[PDB]
């Protein structure tokens, strides 16, 4: 990946989102979209959204992932790394991060992830996984 995909260019799918992590008023989700650039039906686009309704702000957010040897994964820089405390008057804020996934051989996608973030005096370290991906043949038809 010298290849980037600007946010502006992504057309959302009709696939439901998938909740990756949900704790401490902090939530990560995957939205899946067809690769908007023609000529690569073996790339999944994963719009990662990170949302907070925590009473304190959330800082130092890093999201990482890994994928089977046979496929690759790239993470474009996130829109940001912190979130404001919940405020009833303002609109909720989101961090967005684009995540690219190359599956030439077209096998079942699994994904591990690490999430580090800070909230007050506390740091959090999560490691887990995701397997609710759209079947790899469908990656052109969404």
């Amino acid at each position: 990946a010298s290849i980037t995909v600007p946010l502006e260019s992504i057309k959302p799918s009709n696939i439901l989102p998938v909740t990756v992590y949900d704790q401490h008023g902090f939530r990560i989700l995957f939205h899946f979209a067809r690769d908007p650039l023609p000529g690569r039906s073996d790339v999944l686009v994963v719009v990662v959204s990170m949302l907070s309704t925590a009473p304190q702000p959330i800082r130092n957010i890093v999201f990482q992932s890994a994928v089977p040897k046979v496929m690759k994964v790239k993470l474009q820089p996130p829109s940001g790394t912190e979130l404001p405390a919940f405020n009833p008057i303002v609109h909720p804020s989101a961090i967005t991060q684009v995540l690219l996934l190359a599956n030439p051989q077209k096998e079942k996608v699994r994904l591990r992830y690490k999430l580090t973030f800070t909230m007050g005096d506390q740091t959090y370290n999560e490691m887990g996984d995701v397997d609710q991906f759209p079947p790899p043949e469908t990656w052109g038809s969404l």
Binding site: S65, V67, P68, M71, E107, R110
Partner: peptide, 11 residues
């Protein structure tokens, strides 16, 4: 199918 290394973004 064993896993690759963890990737992150250029900070």
């Amino acid at each position: 199918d064993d896993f690759g290394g963890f990737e992150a973004a250029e900070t």
